[PDB]
PDB file of C-alpha atoms in Angstrom:
ATOM      1  CA  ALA A   9      81.310 182.259 127.296  1.00 21.80           C
ATOM      2  CA  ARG A  10      82.788 185.777 127.275  1.00 22.79           C
ATOM      3  CA  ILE A  11      81.146 187.780 124.239  1.00 17.89           C
ATOM      4  CA  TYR A  12      83.210 190.164 122.334  1.00 14.53           C
ATOM      5  CA  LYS A  13      82.493 192.817 119.494  1.00 12.95           C
ATOM      6  CA  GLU A  14      84.361 192.802 116.413  1.00 11.51           C
ATOM      7  CA  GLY A  15      87.782 194.702 116.787  1.00  8.04           C
ATOM      8  CA  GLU A  16      88.030 194.150 120.386  1.00  8.71           C
ATOM      9  CA  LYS A  17      91.227 193.246 122.282  1.00  5.03           C
ATOM     10  CA  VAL A  18      91.200 189.636 123.918  1.00  5.75           C
ATOM     11  CA  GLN A  19      93.357 188.170 126.458  1.00  7.47           C
ATOM     12  CA  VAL A  20      93.435 184.369 126.838  1.00  6.24           C
ATOM     13  CA  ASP A  21      95.093 183.028 130.050  1.00  6.64           C
ATOM     14  CA  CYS A  22      96.212 179.639 131.309  1.00 10.62           C
ATOM     15  CA  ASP A  23      95.841 178.648 134.973  1.00 12.27           C
ATOM     16  CA  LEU A  24      97.991 175.655 134.720  1.00 13.69           C
ATOM     17  CA  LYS A  25     100.397 175.328 137.844  1.00 14.95           C
ATOM     18  CA  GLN A  26     103.886 176.519 136.854  1.00 15.70           C
ATOM     19  CA  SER A  27     106.377 174.078 135.824  1.00 12.77           C
ATOM     20  CA  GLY A  28     109.324 173.996 133.283  1.00 13.63           C
ATOM     21  CA  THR A  29     107.124 171.909 131.057  1.00 10.12           C
ATOM     22  CA  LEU A  30     106.322 172.026 127.176  1.00 11.44           C
ATOM     23  CA  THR A  31     102.640 173.299 127.070  1.00 13.10           C
ATOM     24  CA  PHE A  32     100.666 173.601 123.961  1.00 15.19           C
ATOM     25  CA  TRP A  33      97.903 176.037 123.171  1.00 13.59           C
ATOM     26  CA  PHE A  34      95.326 175.418 120.874  1.00 11.40           C
ATOM     27  CA  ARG A  35      91.723 175.992 120.188  1.00 13.88           C
ATOM     28  CA  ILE A  36      88.578 174.062 119.276  1.00 15.30           C
ATOM     29  CA  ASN A  37      85.901 175.526 116.916  1.00 22.38           C
ATOM     30  CA  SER A  38      83.275 174.166 114.453  1.00 19.97           C
ATOM     31  CA  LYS A  39      85.842 173.730 111.730  1.00 19.67           C
ATOM     32  CA  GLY A  40      88.150 171.675 113.883  1.00 19.41           C
ATOM     33  CA  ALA A  41      91.128 171.845 116.435  1.00 18.99           C
ATOM     34  CA  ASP A  42      93.548 174.475 115.435  1.00 17.31           C
ATOM     35  CA  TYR A  43      97.253 174.548 116.713  1.00 17.94           C
ATOM     36  CA  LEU A  44      98.326 177.997 118.179  1.00 19.94           C
ATOM     37  CA  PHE A  45     101.795 177.717 119.815  1.00 18.92           C
ATOM     38  CA  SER A  46     103.998 176.165 122.524  1.00 19.02           C
ATOM     39  CA  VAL A  47     105.836 177.251 125.281  1.00 17.91           C
ATOM     40  CA  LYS A  48     108.369 175.995 128.060  1.00 19.23           C
ATOM     41  CA  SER A  49     108.461 178.416 130.886  1.00 16.66           C
ATOM     42  CA  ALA A  50     108.675 181.569 128.958  1.00 19.18           C
ATOM     43  CA  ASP A  51     110.556 180.352 125.902  1.00 18.66           C
ATOM     44  CA  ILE A  52     108.561 179.889 122.723  1.00 21.52           C
ATOM     45  CA  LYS A  53     109.228 176.443 121.175  1.00 21.82           C
ATOM     46  CA  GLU A  54     106.761 176.647 118.002  1.00 22.70           C
ATOM     47  CA  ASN A  55     104.429 179.496 116.832  1.00 26.33           C
ATOM     48  CA  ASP A  56     102.029 179.011 114.043  1.00 24.64           C
ATOM     49  CA  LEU A  57     100.468 182.570 114.646  1.00 26.16           C
ATOM     50  CA  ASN A  58     100.774 185.810 112.661  1.00 26.49           C
ATOM     51  CA  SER A  59     102.422 188.485 114.666  1.00 27.25           C
ATOM     52  CA  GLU A  60     100.401 191.095 113.081  1.00 27.42           C
ATOM     53  CA  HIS A  61      97.176 189.751 114.477  1.00 29.42           C
ATOM     54  CA  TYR A  62      98.258 187.883 117.640  1.00 33.68           C
ATOM     55  CA  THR A  63     100.880 188.362 120.329  1.00 33.51           C
ATOM     56  CA  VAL A  64     102.311 185.607 123.047  1.00 34.50           C
ATOM     57  CA  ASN A  65     102.898 187.905 125.859  1.00 37.02           C
ATOM     58  CA  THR A  66     105.340 186.567 128.438  1.00 35.90           C
ATOM     59  CA  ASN A  67     105.188 189.531 130.835  1.00 34.04           C
ATOM     60  CA  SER A  68     104.204 189.413 134.418  1.00 33.21           C
ATOM     61  CA  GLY A  69     105.795 186.069 135.046  1.00 32.91           C
ATOM     62  CA  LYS A  70     103.104 184.080 133.183  1.00 34.65           C
ATOM     63  CA  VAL A  71     102.071 183.381 129.624  1.00 32.68           C
ATOM     64  CA  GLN A  72      99.009 184.818 127.691  1.00 33.62           C
ATOM     65  CA  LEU A  73      97.678 185.022 124.289  1.00 32.12           C
ATOM     66  CA  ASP A  74      96.673 188.441 122.966  1.00 29.69           C
ATOM     67  CA  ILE A  75      94.295 188.897 120.252  1.00 26.88           C
ATOM     68  CA  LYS A  76      94.706 192.389 118.698  1.00 25.96           C
ATOM     69  CA  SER A  77      91.372 192.476 117.007  1.00 27.22           C
ATOM     70  CA  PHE A  78      88.648 189.819 117.469  1.00 26.47           C
ATOM     71  CA  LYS A  79      87.082 188.499 114.634  1.00 23.95           C
ATOM     72  CA  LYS A  80      83.993 186.130 115.287  1.00 24.72           C
ATOM     73  CA  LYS A  81      84.679 184.037 112.096  1.00 24.16           C
ATOM     74  CA  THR A  82      88.189 183.146 113.162  1.00 28.03           C
ATOM     75  CA  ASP A  83      88.808 183.356 116.974  1.00 31.90           C
ATOM     76  CA  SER A  84      85.533 182.098 118.355  1.00 32.72           C
ATOM     77  CA  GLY A  85      85.653 178.628 120.304  1.00 33.64           C
ATOM     78  CA  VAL A  86      87.160 176.815 123.116  1.00 33.13           C
ATOM     79  CA  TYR A  87      90.810 177.735 124.076  1.00 34.30           C
ATOM     80  CA  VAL A  88      92.913 174.836 125.845  1.00 35.03           C
ATOM     81  CA  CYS A  89      96.239 174.521 127.290  1.00 31.35           C
ATOM     82  CA  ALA A  90      98.123 171.145 127.639  1.00 27.18           C
ATOM     83  CA  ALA A  91     101.288 170.355 129.764  1.00 27.33           C
ATOM     84  CA  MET A  92     102.992 167.219 128.630  1.00 26.20           C
ATOM     85  CA  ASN A  93     104.656 164.992 131.162  1.00 24.22           C
ATOM     86  CA  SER A  94     104.501 161.194 131.651  1.00 22.72           C
ATOM     87  CA  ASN A  95     103.245 160.650 128.093  1.00 21.55           C
ATOM     88  CA  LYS A  96     100.237 162.515 128.702  1.00 19.78           C
ATOM     89  CA  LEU A  97      98.540 165.884 128.853  1.00 19.95           C
ATOM     90  CA  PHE A  98      97.363 167.918 131.800  1.00 18.44           C
ATOM     91  CA  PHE A  99      94.743 170.412 131.041  1.00 16.40           C
ATOM     92  CA  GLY A 100      94.096 173.778 132.182  1.00 15.75           C
ATOM     93  CA  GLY A 101      90.602 175.449 132.496  1.00 13.93           C
ATOM     94  CA  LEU A 102      88.797 176.041 129.216  1.00 15.28           C
ATOM     95  CA  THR A 103      88.209 179.485 128.103  1.00 16.30           C
ATOM     96  CA  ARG A 104      85.211 179.857 125.862  1.00 15.66           C
ATOM     97  CA  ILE A 105      84.766 182.955 123.665  1.00 17.16           C
ATOM     98  CA  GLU A 106      82.110 183.970 121.092  1.00 17.41           C
ATOM     99  CA  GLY A 107      81.261 187.249 119.087  1.00 16.08           C
ATOM    100  CA  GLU A 108      77.865 189.606 118.815  1.00 16.09           C
TER     101      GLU A 108
ATOM    102  CA  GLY B   6      75.778 173.602 111.938  1.00 13.76           C
ATOM    103  CA  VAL B   7      77.980 170.692 113.359  1.00 11.42           C
ATOM    104  CA  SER B   8      77.786 167.026 112.525  1.00 12.91           C
ATOM    105  CA  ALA B   9      77.606 164.450 115.378  1.00 14.17           C
ATOM    106  CA  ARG B  10      76.544 160.798 116.133  1.00 17.12           C
ATOM    107  CA  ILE B  11      73.823 159.967 118.657  1.00 18.61           C
ATOM    108  CA  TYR B  12      73.912 156.928 120.718  1.00 17.88           C
ATOM    109  CA  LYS B  13      71.368 155.217 123.105  1.00 15.60           C
ATOM    110  CA  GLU B  14      72.492 154.425 126.641  1.00 12.16           C
ATOM    111  CA  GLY B  15      74.235 151.233 126.545  1.00 13.98           C
ATOM    112  CA  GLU B  16      75.082 151.292 122.819  1.00 15.20           C
ATOM    113  CA  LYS B  17      78.925 150.203 121.859  1.00 17.42           C
ATOM    114  CA  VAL B  18      80.896 153.241 120.511  1.00 16.61           C
ATOM    115  CA  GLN B  19      83.921 152.932 118.405  1.00 16.17           C
ATOM    116  CA  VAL B  20      85.954 156.354 118.072  1.00 13.71           C
ATOM    117  CA  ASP B  21      88.597 156.530 115.193  1.00 13.97           C
ATOM    118  CA  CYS B  22      91.497 158.758 114.238  1.00 11.54           C
ATOM    119  CA  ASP B  23      92.117 159.835 110.679  1.00 12.05           C
ATOM    120  CA  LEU B  24      95.622 161.054 111.253  1.00 11.94           C
ATOM    121  CA  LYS B  25      97.964 159.500 108.713  1.00 10.08           C
ATOM    122  CA  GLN B  26      99.798 156.625 110.600  1.00  9.80           C
ATOM    123  CA  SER B  27     103.238 157.664 111.381  1.00  6.47           C
ATOM    124  CA  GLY B  28     105.136 156.309 114.544  1.00  4.41           C
ATOM    125  CA  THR B  29     104.699 159.453 116.581  1.00  4.27           C
ATOM    126  CA  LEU B  30     103.395 159.676 120.038  1.00  5.21           C
ATOM    127  CA  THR B  31      99.562 160.395 119.663  1.00  3.47           C
ATOM    128  CA  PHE B  32      97.407 161.759 122.643  1.00  7.88           C
ATOM    129  CA  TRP B  33      93.847 160.905 122.848  1.00  6.65           C
ATOM    130  CA  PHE B  34      91.471 163.241 124.842  1.00  7.44           C
ATOM    131  CA  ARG B  35      87.917 164.565 124.928  1.00  5.75           C
ATOM    132  CA  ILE B  36      86.340 167.824 125.871  1.00  6.34           C
ATOM    133  CA  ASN B  37      82.707 168.102 127.417  1.00  8.29           C
ATOM    134  CA  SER B  38      81.216 170.824 129.497  1.00  6.94           C
ATOM    135  CA  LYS B  39      83.315 169.933 132.562  1.00  6.13           C
ATOM    136  CA  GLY B  40      86.516 170.334 130.849  1.00  4.18           C
ATOM    137  CA  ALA B  41      89.218 168.472 128.741  1.00  5.04           C
ATOM    138  CA  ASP B  42      89.625 164.874 129.872  1.00  3.94           C
ATOM    139  CA  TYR B  43      92.749 162.941 129.014  1.00  6.46           C
ATOM    140  CA  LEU B  44      92.104 159.455 127.858  1.00  4.75           C
ATOM    141  CA  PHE B  45      95.183 157.493 126.580  1.00  7.84           C
ATOM    142  CA  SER B  46      98.312 157.809 124.255  1.00  6.49           C
ATOM    143  CA  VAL B  47      99.674 155.457 121.849  1.00  3.47           C
ATOM    144  CA  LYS B  48     102.977 155.346 119.586  1.00  3.42           C
ATOM    145  CA  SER B  49     102.064 153.243 116.720  1.00  2.00           C
ATOM    146  CA  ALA B  50     100.307 150.049 118.527  1.00  2.00           C
ATOM    147  CA  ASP B  51     102.047 150.402 121.966  1.00  2.00           C
ATOM    148  CA  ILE B  52     100.314 152.035 124.917  1.00  2.00           C
ATOM    149  CA  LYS B  53     102.577 154.615 126.496  1.00  2.00           C
ATOM    150  CA  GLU B  54      99.783 155.986 129.104  1.00  2.00           C
ATOM    151  CA  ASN B  55      96.045 154.913 129.662  1.00  2.00           C
ATOM    152  CA  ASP B  56      93.901 156.654 132.196  1.00  2.00           C
ATOM    153  CA  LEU B  57      90.980 154.500 131.088  1.00  2.00           C
ATOM    154  CA  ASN B  58      89.436 151.699 133.226  1.00  2.00           C
ATOM    155  CA  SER B  59      89.504 148.511 131.142  1.00  2.00           C
ATOM    156  CA  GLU B  60      86.169 147.300 132.367  1.00  2.00           C
ATOM    157  CA  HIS B  61      84.377 150.111 130.528  1.00  2.00           C
ATOM    158  CA  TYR B  62      86.919 150.985 127.722  1.00  2.00           C
ATOM    159  CA  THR B  63      89.207 149.020 125.313  1.00  2.00           C
ATOM    160  CA  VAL B  64      92.097 150.531 123.287  1.00  2.00           C
ATOM    161  CA  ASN B  65      91.898 148.526 119.977  1.00  2.00           C
ATOM    162  CA  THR B  66      95.016 148.109 118.060  1.00  2.00           C
ATOM    163  CA  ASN B  67      93.833 145.188 115.441  1.00  2.00           C
ATOM    164  CA  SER B  68      94.819 146.197 111.912  1.00  2.00           C
ATOM    165  CA  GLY B  69      97.586 148.816 112.772  1.00  2.00           C
ATOM    166  CA  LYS B  70      94.820 151.448 113.388  1.00  2.00           C
ATOM    167  CA  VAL B  71      94.058 152.523 117.108  1.00  2.00           C
ATOM    168  CA  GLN B  72      90.387 152.720 118.013  1.00  2.00           C
ATOM    169  CA  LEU B  73      88.905 153.528 121.144  1.00  2.00           C
ATOM    170  CA  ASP B  74      86.081 151.070 122.134  1.00  2.00           C
ATOM    171  CA  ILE B  75      83.409 152.336 124.605  1.00  2.00           C
ATOM    172  CA  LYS B  76      81.812 149.108 125.935  1.00  2.00           C
ATOM    173  CA  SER B  77      78.264 150.755 127.003  1.00  2.00           C
ATOM    174  CA  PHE B  78      77.767 154.431 126.192  1.00  2.00           C
ATOM    175  CA  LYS B  79      76.740 156.524 128.984  1.00  2.00           C
ATOM    176  CA  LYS B  80      75.660 160.026 127.872  1.00  2.00           C
ATOM    177  CA  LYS B  81      76.586 161.847 131.259  1.00  2.00           C
ATOM    178  CA  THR B  82      80.134 160.757 131.115  1.00  2.00           C
ATOM    179  CA  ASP B  83      80.891 159.845 127.318  1.00  2.00           C
ATOM    180  CA  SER B  84      79.362 162.745 125.442  1.00  2.00           C
ATOM    181  CA  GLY B  85      81.731 165.342 123.859  1.00  2.00           C
ATOM    182  CA  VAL B  86      84.182 165.972 121.324  1.00  2.00           C
ATOM    183  CA  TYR B  87      87.008 163.482 120.830  1.00  2.00           C
ATOM    184  CA  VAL B  88      90.410 164.606 119.743  1.00  2.00           C
ATOM    185  CA  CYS B  89      93.616 162.892 118.615  1.00  2.00           C
ATOM    186  CA  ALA B  90      96.783 164.911 118.491  1.00  2.00           C
ATOM    187  CA  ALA B  91     100.180 163.782 117.227  1.00  2.00           C
ATOM    188  CA  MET B  92     103.235 165.485 118.514  1.00  2.00           C
ATOM    189  CA  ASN B  93     106.314 166.513 116.426  1.00  2.00           C
ATOM    190  CA  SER B  94     108.438 169.813 116.190  1.00  2.00           C
ATOM    191  CA  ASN B  95     107.497 171.109 119.323  1.00  2.00           C
ATOM    192  CA  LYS B  96     103.577 171.324 118.244  1.00  2.00           C
ATOM    193  CA  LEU B  97     100.484 169.100 117.788  1.00  2.00           C
ATOM    194  CA  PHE B  98      98.862 167.844 114.599  1.00  2.00           C
ATOM    195  CA  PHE B  99      95.222 167.201 114.875  1.00  2.00           C
ATOM    196  CA  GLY B 100      92.822 164.382 113.174  1.00  2.00           C
ATOM    197  CA  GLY B 101      88.987 165.430 112.305  1.00  2.00           C
ATOM    198  CA  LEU B 102      86.971 165.882 115.392  1.00  2.00           C
ATOM    199  CA  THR B 103      84.468 163.204 116.359  1.00  4.36           C
ATOM    200  CA  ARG B 104      81.526 164.661 118.275  1.00  4.86           C
ATOM    201  CA  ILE B 105      79.309 161.961 120.153  1.00  3.64           C
ATOM    202  CA  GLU B 106      75.923 162.844 121.929  1.00  2.00           C
ATOM    203  CA  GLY B 107      73.287 160.839 123.990  1.00  2.00           C
ATOM    204  CA  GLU B 108      69.581 160.780 122.949  1.00  3.18           C
ATOM    205  CA  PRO B 109      67.742 163.999 124.501  1.00  2.93           C
TER     206      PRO B 109
END
């Protein structure tokens, strides 16, 4: 459970094995499940994020979520990536991030 | 805080999904401190994939609502946050979370 101060940069990764499969990113916090974006290899398929505050970085042959300015209220929780295949989801390792 | 339901060992648990019924493929899973664990998926009333053992879990489709029925609760395996997620437009739409814990 990485702790971050207000305004710090945060990088969230996904350790899923590479495939060419549609992969969803989302997060779970105390207000609910919140959908972030989806990719297939390096191509964005849907993005609910404001570009001002969040970047989907596809440099270095992998995909990561960059939070430009951490805010406890909004960005705290469990981050999940899920690859879909065979009518099911395959999950990566969770990343948990909190404030103070 | 966070609202949750508390169960004794061996109680039945019914988990619901408040997503509006459309006929969109819907993934059911749970998150605990070991990770995210995939459960089953359903399109309307039709199972499309089920990783659950029938002896311990039943996917109940009576009423044209889908419920997961846990036959006999076990805190060590069954505690966590249960999620349902419909897929459309290359994204997920989530129902309200259901958290479930054992007695301490």
